Subunit: 247 residues, 2 copies
């Protein structure tokens, strides 16, 4: 569902000294023009990055934000500052927030819509636990969580869904191209019956869960895997391998 989209969720990792690597390496790079990749760094160097960036494809996003754009919110992230500072995207509902931070669907659902309110890009994170898998329906979970959003967000023109199995986030267990692609159609099917199919045709649904330079090509002709949200190796030089694999 068209333009190959590659994200790098640096999580709590970095030095300005080190993101200089990252991003410089990135500016230097032979990557197509028919691409769109965003760098989701720690909230403190989201403007340094912005200033390091010298390649049209790349844009900076954020790891997380609040649902309010200013207030008595000691310790939170404002979409308005992120934009104000350069950034264009914001990751939401990552599994690192849903389990570590008891961030419910609903929060994730106000977050989402608001930010699109403010005109920022939202990379929405969904997935299932080794437990839901084994219980089979995985598709509940992703539809229970993807609904929480639908009630609120009508126009998705801006959302990039990131399908991310909790058992693959940084564990070395990527999901197989075929069950991965399988999950995506469903998603796409899902949303079809709701966002309408010209929408679902343009919606971008990404795969994340131990995507590494090496397994990137393994995915290169799957229809519903229109990208990646790479954490761990978005750090390595091998991040570029991911983007140059044509999927």
């Amino acid at each position: 569902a068209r333009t190959f989209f590659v994200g790098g969720n640096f999580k709590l990792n970095g030095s300005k000294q080190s993101i200089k690597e990252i991003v410089e390496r990135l500016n230097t790079a032979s990557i197509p023009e028919n691409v769109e990749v965003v760098i989701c760094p720690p909230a403190t160097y989201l403007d340094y990055s912005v200033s390091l960036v010298k390649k049209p494809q790349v844009t900076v996003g954020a790891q997380n934000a609040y649902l309010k754009a200013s207030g008595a919110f000691t310790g939170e992230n404002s979409v308005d500052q992120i934009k104000d500072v350069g950034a264009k995207w914001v990751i939401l509902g990552h599994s690192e927030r849903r389990s570590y931070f008891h961030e419910d669907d609903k929060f994730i659902a106000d977050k989402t819509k608001f930010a699109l309110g403010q005109g920022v890009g939202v990379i929405l994170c969904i997935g299932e636990t080794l437990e839901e898998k084994k219980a089979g329906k995985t598709l509940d979970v992703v539809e229970r969580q993807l609904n929480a959003v639908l009630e609120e967000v009508k126009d998705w023109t801006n959302v990039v869904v990131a399908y991310e199995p909790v058992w693959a986030i940084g564990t070395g267990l990527a999901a197989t191209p075929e069950d991965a692609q399988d999950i995506h159609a469903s998603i796409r099917k899902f949303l079809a019956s709701k966002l309408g199919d010209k929408a679902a045709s343009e919606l971008r649904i990404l795969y994340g869960g131990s995507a590494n330079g090496s397994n990137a090509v393994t995915f290169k002709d799957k229809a519903d895997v229109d990208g990646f949200l790479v954490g761990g190796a978005s750090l390595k030089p091998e991040f570029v391998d991911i983007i140059n694999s044509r999927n």
Copy 2:
């Protein structure tokens, strides 16, 4: 004497221009000496802030950080990155995280801990809810809140305790200078031979809860009221007033 500290916590406020006007006015308003201001903007405007301050009597800090300096915690702030960007402080334990973001005594504890580990001070907010208060427990609360740290922190050479009645933050409802002096005083003691007289002596106890230019002067002659955590009032000129009334 045993040095005046007026902390300005921007909560979810600042623009690169707000932060600067704020920053230059301070850079340019006569309000010296034994005064120490640690201003605290979003993670987002942290590096710019310094850049504009750096550290005469003016130092920067962050409204929150997590308990590990690096890893996979999407969204988090990392002691180590606020250190890198030239930040010296970290508000830890404020009433906002604690209620809405539900971090707890033990959380706060393990983070004040990891926090100084890296040699960054903490601005340990302790405070009582409007019930606490009537059921007369603020001795208890505070003293419990504080125990939970104490049970992980040994050295408090670089801790600054923010005493904030939970009903005085953002309400207008300042604590009367009386009880003001009463409670600070009381815990200088409990704090006393938790860790000795010297420490109890070189250590500050901040008062916060609608602290501002006007009422600021009323704690003038309060030994034990070694300063404040200004939310609201750090966004204006009054900030300057507040650090020109001495102690």
